[PDB]
Amino acid sequence: VERCGVLSKWTNYIHGWQDRWVVLKNNALSYYKSEDETEYGCRGSICLSKAVITPHDFDECRFDISVNDSVWYLRAQDPDHRQQWIDAIEQHKT
């Protein structure tokens, strides 16, 4: 299953943090400007084959997805844990 949710982080403006729509499915992570996704097309997309799930420093539930130096600061929504990403990618990957 895809993890589809909004991630509050900057898009273009350094102080222009907004809710961007991220989807983790198939074996790729894709993000759009916001939850309206489809009309935005695609803003970014990485392949979860060598994208390392890096546990964040100060955060216990935040996980930085790093591939091609593209660091995706993800986090467990609230009732979630790391295993969301693990199980998802593990069940998506080849």
Residue 4: CATH number of its domain: 2.30.29.30
Rounded Cα–Cα distance for residues 16 and 94 (Å): 36
Residue 48's CB: how many other CB atoms inside 10 A?
21
Q: What number of helices (H) and strands (E) belong to the chain?
A: 1, 7
Domain that holds residue 80: 1-94
24 HSE (CA, 13 A, CB side): 23
CB 61 within 8 A of CB 81: yes
CB 65 within 8 A of CB 52: yes
Residue 5's CB: how many other CB atoms inside 10 A?
16
CB 31 within 8 A of CB 44: yes
Rounded Cα–Cα distance for residues 15 and 65 (Å): 22
- Residue 62 has which token pair? 């935040």
Provide the number of structural domains found in the chain: 1
Which residues lie across from 62 on neighbouring strands? 75
Rounded Cα–Cα distance for residues 54 and 51 (Å): 9
- Residue 15 has which token pair? 């102080």
Q: Which residue has the tokens 């997805």?
A: 65
* DSSP single-letter state for residue 36: T
Rounded Cα–Cα distance for residues 13 and 74 (Å): 19
37 HSE (CA, 13 A, CB side): 11
Q: H helices within 1-94, ranges in order?
A: 83-92
